[PDB]
């Protein structure tokens, strides 16, 4: 039968004490959720390790083997009456050869049976109760150094059952405690792989990059001349005479098939040292033609004989290049002495040993010499595994249309890389391309809100990736993950697991050239193109005019960060630590350190500059008033309260609760780590800031707009308010007739916002994402102290305690290279940041300065409206501006005119437009409707009626 | 994080319309051409004269597609979230509303307005009476016309105005380029090659040559993404300009001395460009 | 640890749990008024108890 | 300019002057990556400034 | 003479034009922008000794 393992099997990784920490590892685990065998005595398969599991006592050990005979060693296990008993002999299934022994002194019993580097492990949990679901660990008990090959195994004496462990990679969890409480298999889904990868549990909404994808080939190609002929190394090796070395003769070898094996596996030659190659490697290989050297030379000149040597063979005789590819055999079985100059190299002039040097042309023309290998078949439009004429590589192959002059072999790039090649048989020329790779994508609606994926393949055409995927030739080879019957080409790439909508909405999740993603409806993820507004028609007229006739008062918010959080670091104790020797081998690089401090710290003076730039713009400090109602105007919820503890004011009270933020070594009584990292604390507290924006508002509903520019200047605050009705361009009766109403508006928006802050909708996420980025470069910066770079270990303690000092350099020269590098990525980064922070500060700053002490005129520079006023409030690393603006609501349609004509004189009105009643002609202004009579008083003279272009006949008052 | 920045540039420049005004069926008010402008429907694209002629002006290997074919390299480019035809018909409702509402929809919903009694508001807006609109409007309309016809004459002309655009594309090309070309050094190995290493050598040599060349590989990606990272905060810069100007020139009316173009400011009008906007 | 830094340990003859930390580093800075003015100084031992 | 990294001196000219051609390659290409690193560091710094 | 020369090869595969770099400034100008066609301005090609 068949069962199914969820989430069972894990055990222990290794004997190391870890606790609040998600660890990620790799070795052989059971997968989630794969198959299991219920036996309810074959002999079973130990592939490369099982998961044998017993729900009840019929079961009391095993016999693990090879051949489960008395001609090979196998290890039994077995509980007898409180002794457990293993033994290592040669069996009838008595004991002919042995070498180990162990003798020491329902239910749900669990072991996991693993055999590496002839070491047994055996680990083993227990849980009280079909295989149940659930998830257990499992500790160790012991490993066996019995070095016997285990394919078989047995059960003694039925209900247990059987899984098969494979190298995958979990993400374990480990408790405040040290126990394992949570895992996740990062190759069971897409969304598993995300969670691996974000290194968390929790997944908010969106797009992700995880992986890159690959498709494997399916195919071997190899294509090498046709040559049948063995190859006359007897007549240049095994021959009677040689000429001196002042004479030496020069052999061409080609049009062969060179074994080369019959020099090597000899110990016939005294030296055989190659440049250039290596041995091994000649049987693949293959060369235009070799040429051959033969002559006879002294017993200590045979040194002589190298590529950059001196002497009177070396300079007289015979000379190699530097360059040198091909290789000398010398054996054990006359010269030049006077000459004016050198030679040139491969020229000549016209104990004993017998020496014989090898030179390769390496593919300029046709390969005559190539070694014994077998060829079949071209393989074109799949990707395959190509070897022409020894050159390796992998890719697809199809017909080209380029013209090779009879001289050329292949083709090149600008990046050296051979894009076509000649067939040594057919003499057909072939292009090459790469296999489909790039990156992957998952787009996910929360795993809050569910656990489906959708997974987008990024820059490729796809009916390759499914017939990849239905083939099973992908890299990223998700076990549980079908492709479905939704597939959809995008010009990012293309989507498997979202459904294409043909009804727009605004932009969700940006997936890319006008297609986005949603969560709609039951539910499932969506695939639209993006609406870019919503529709409207205005009517074009050349006599017609809309004016308003009512007002709404609006109050929004604009969140800006100002700073972020100062940092230092110990170079000595980041790179070396408590170690002398890393000291002094690290004095060898000048003055890094002393520049990297330097640079920290001018970023963190910067942070606190950025801070008074903003904030303390006020040179006097207004005290809060005891009553907090002007007019009608309840300021209550923006000014501090005296009868709570804290200096903030309500909305600041909800703005600090509402972001949420270390363990590096800041003091906050406060400890320190060994990585040596910190972070200092600001020259503003946060009561010195919320005193400073405390005084703003204070000296804003007292004074007004006068303390910005000299000195503060009392004032009522309808009086104030009508004054900014003016600045707007709308008279003071406007106000001083409806102030209730205004009142109210102000005070409705201002609870609005109140309780659109305590709803929990994020707002304030820019200064999250600046909290955020800090948080993961530090997080960078840790986490690369555990690579060691080349190095045996990433400790220098171990390296220090288990070496001696000669080879404790090399390897502590290796990590300090590396850490350095990581330090430097580190420091440039954050001064890029640091430029950024800057320019957000300075924006900041002139928008206390313009917006808050004044009346901007600006369009949207501090709102969406006609700006009144502004406050500022205080959150933490930045400030939320709350503009109050004025907005026009309900319209009319009228008939207008540009002048009117009374007595042969055209009228113009003074400030405002003509507009018709419905019954007769009155003037009034843009931004409200309050009409008046036309009169002298507001209309000027200039002309006659007889060129303005659409002129009316209307009587003026006097 | 560089790519997923400049899709937010292009957002905060031109979406800044909450409604799209569809153009109107007469681009004639009370005198002014708008014809250069505004979209034709009797064309099969949705850019307007001048738009096309800026589109023509600028003149912009690695993978990349619109068949999808790759490269050795590794190298691609990726598309962008807003296409050539949605930036278009921002453009376009935009030049509608200006020419029908005036300046009243940035700050609330759009009222229609006539447009000479609009340009009268313009013009004692700089400090001078409207009868000096209403009665030389003809004259008005005229210069106007006559300036929208030198604007076409002079870019049809093939003078380099859009010189910065070009060189955006030139610095981008150029980066990549140098990028693809340190893939032929060799850093002290025997060659720049993986595979004539690979297959000429033995496992304990090719350890040390293949360090050697992922050493100064590494080395020049890291100096890409670092050149990459500045030159997105001067593109982010000029962006966040742009807005700026397109809130306080094209949705008003600024007193800034010399802020939107020389002179004192009446009206303005934005076009797209090659990733770009160019002011009129 | 997370850097790979060994912080506990077991005694092998007690068998009692030990915490390792490290004793005290950080920089220093010195506060001066201009050696013209003066040449006393205060002296800041950055984040120690 | 005056750091060896790990050279046996600082100084090209001496390096030339009193060693072979095959050690001298070793300890001029220590300087050179030395050299290297620190003119990039210049111009990096100087591009954000 | 040993020189350095900048080879035009055809769409086809045949070199087709070529300039000796070491002829005049101009030569010398075309091989390092790598192209036939020169703009206007002021341009750094090398260094003198
Ligand atoms: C014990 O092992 C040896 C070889 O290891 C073998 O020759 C011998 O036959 C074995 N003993 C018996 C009794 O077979
Ligand atoms: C060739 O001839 C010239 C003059 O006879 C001589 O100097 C030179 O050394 C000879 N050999 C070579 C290899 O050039
Ligand atoms: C090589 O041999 C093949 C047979 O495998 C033959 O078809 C082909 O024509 C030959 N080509 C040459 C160039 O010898
Ligand atoms: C303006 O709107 C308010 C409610 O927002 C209403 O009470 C008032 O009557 C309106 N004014 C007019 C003239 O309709
Ligand atoms: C001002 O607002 C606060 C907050 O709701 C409220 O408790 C207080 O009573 C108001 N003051 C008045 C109505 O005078
Ligand atoms: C015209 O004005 C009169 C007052 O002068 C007003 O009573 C009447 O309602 C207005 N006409 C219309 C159509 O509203
Ligand atoms: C507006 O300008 C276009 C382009 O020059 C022209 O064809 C059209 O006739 C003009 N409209 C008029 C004159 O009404
Ligand atoms: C390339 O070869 C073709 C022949 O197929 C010839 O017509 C053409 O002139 C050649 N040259 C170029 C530049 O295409």
Not at 348 to 357: A, F, G, S
Not at 811 to 818: A, C, K
Request: aromatic fraction near 12%; hydrophobic fraction near 40%; charge should be neutral.
């Amino acid at each position: 039968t068949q069962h199914t393992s969820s989430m069972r099997g894990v055990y222990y990784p290794d004997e190391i004490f870890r606790s609040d920490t998600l660890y990620l590892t790799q070795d052989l685990f059971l997968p989630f959720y794969s198959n299991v065998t219920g036996f309810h005595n074959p002999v079973i398969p130990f592939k490369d390790g099982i998961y044998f599991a017993a729900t009840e006592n019929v079961v009391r050990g095993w016999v693990f083997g090879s051949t489960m005979n008395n001609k090979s060693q196998s290890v039994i296990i077995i509980n007898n009456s409180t002794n457990v008993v293993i033994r290592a002999c040669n069996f009838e299934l008595n004991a002919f050869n042995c070498t180990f022994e162990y003798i020491s002194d329902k239910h749900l019993r669990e072991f996991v049976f693993k055999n590496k580097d002839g070491f047994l492990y055996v680990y083993k949990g227990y849980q009280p109760i079909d295989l149940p679901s659930g998830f257990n660990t499992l500790k160790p008990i012991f490993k066996l150094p019995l070095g016997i090959n285990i394919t078989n195994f047995r059960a003694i004496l039925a209900a247990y059952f059987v899984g098969y462990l494979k190298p995958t990679t979990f993400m374990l969890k480990y408790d405040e405690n040290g126990t394992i409480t949570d895992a996740v298999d990062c190759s069971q889904n897409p969304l598993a792989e995300l969670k691996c990868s974000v290194k968390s549990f929790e997944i908010d909404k969106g797009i992700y990059q995880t992986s890159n994808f690959r498709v494997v080939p399916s195919g071997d190609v190899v294509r090498f001349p046709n040559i049948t002929n063995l190859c006359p190394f007897g007549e240049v090796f095994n021959a009677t005479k040689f000429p001196s070395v002042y004479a030496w003769e020069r052999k061409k070898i080609s049009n062969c098939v060179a074994d080369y094996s019959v020099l090597y596996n000899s110990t016939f030659f005294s030296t055989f040292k190659c440049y250039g190659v290596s041995a091994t490697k000649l049987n693949d290989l293959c060369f235009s033609n070799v040429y051959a050297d033969s002559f006879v030379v002294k017993g200590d000149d045979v040194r002589q004989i190298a590529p950059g040597q001196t002497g009177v063979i070396a300079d007289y005789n015979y000379k190699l290049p530097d360059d040198f590819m091909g290789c000398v055999l010398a054996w054990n079985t006359k010269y030049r002495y006077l000459r004016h100059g050198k030679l040139r190299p491969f020229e000549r002039d016209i104990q004993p040993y017998r020496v014989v040097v090898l030179s390769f042309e390496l593919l300029n023309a046709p390969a005559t010499v190539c070694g014994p290998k077998l060829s079949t078949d071209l393989i074109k439009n799949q990707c395959v595994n190509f070897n022409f004429n020894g050159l390796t590589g992998t890719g697809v192959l199809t017909p080209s249309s380029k013209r090779f002059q009879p001289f050329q072999q292949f083709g090149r790039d600008v990046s050296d890389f051979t894009d076509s090649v000649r067939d040594p048989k057919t003499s057909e020329i072939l292009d090459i391309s790469p296999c489909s790779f790039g990156g992957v994508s998952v787009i996910t609606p929360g795993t809050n809100a569910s656990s489906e994926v959708a997974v987008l393949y990024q820059d490729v055409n796809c009916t390759d990736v499914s017939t990849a995927i239905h083939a099973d030739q992908l890299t990223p080879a998700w076990r549980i993950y079908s492709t479905g019957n939704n597939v959809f080409q995008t010009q990012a790439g293309c989507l498997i697991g979202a459904e294409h909508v043909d009804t727009s909405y605004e932009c969700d999740i940006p997936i890319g050239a006008g297609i986005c993603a949603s969560y709609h409806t039951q539910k499932s993820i969506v695939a639209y193109t993006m609406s870019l507004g919503a529709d409207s028609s205005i009517a074009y007229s050349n006599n017609t005019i809309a004016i308003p006739t009512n007002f709404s008062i609006s109050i929004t918010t604009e969140v800006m960060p100002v700073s972020m959080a100062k940092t230092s670091v110990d170079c000595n104790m980041y790179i070396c630590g408590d170690s002398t020797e890393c000291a002094n081998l690290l004095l060898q690089y000048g003055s890094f350190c002393t520049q990297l401090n330097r640079a920290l710290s001018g970023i963190a003076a910067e942070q606190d500059r950025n801070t008074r730039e903003v904030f303390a713009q006020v040179k006097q400090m207004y005290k809060t008033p005891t009553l907090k109602y002007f007019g009608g105007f309840n300021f209550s919820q923006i000014l501090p309260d005296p009868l709570k503890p804290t200096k903030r004011s309500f909305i600041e009270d909800l703005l600090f609760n509402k972001v949420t933020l270390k363990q590096y070594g800041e003091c906050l009584i406060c400890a320190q780590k060994f990585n040596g990292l910190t972070v200092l604390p600001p020259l503003l507290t946060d009561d010195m800031i919320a005193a400073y924006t405390a005084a703003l508002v204070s000296g804003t509903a007292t004074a007004g707009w006068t303390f910005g520019a000299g000195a503060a200047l009392q004032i009522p605050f309808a009086m104030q308010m009508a004054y900014r009705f003016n600045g707007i361009g709308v008279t003071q009766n406007v106000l001083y007739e409806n102030q209730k109403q205004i009142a109210n508006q102000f005070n409705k928006a201002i609870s609005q916002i109140q309780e659109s802050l305590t709803t929990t909708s994020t707002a304030l996420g820019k200064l999250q994402d600046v909290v955020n980025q800090n948080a993961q470069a530090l997080n960078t910066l840790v986490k690369q102290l555990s690579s060691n770079f080349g190095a045996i270990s990433s400790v220098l303690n171990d390296i220090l305690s288990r070496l001696d000092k000669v080879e404790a350099e090399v390897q502590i020269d290796r990590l300090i290279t590396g850490r350095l590098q990581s330090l430097q990525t580190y420091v440039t980064q954050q001064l890029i940041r640091a430029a950024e922070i800057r320019a957000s500060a300075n924006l900041a700053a002139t928008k206390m300065s313009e917006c808050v002490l004044g009346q901007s005129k600006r369009v949207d520079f501090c709102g969406k409206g006609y700006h009144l006023m502004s406050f500022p409030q205080a959150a933490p690393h930045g400030v939320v501006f709350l503009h109050v603006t004025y907005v026009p609501s309900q319209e009319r349609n009228f008939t207008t005119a540009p002048a009117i004509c009374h007595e042969g004189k055209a009228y113009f009105p003074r400030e405002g437009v003509f507009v018709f009643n419905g019954t007769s002609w009155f003037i009034t202004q843009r931004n409200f409707f309050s009409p008046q009579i036309i009169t002298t008083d507001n209309t000027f003279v200039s002309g006659n009626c007889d060129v303005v272009i659409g002129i009316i006949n209307n009587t003026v008052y006097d």
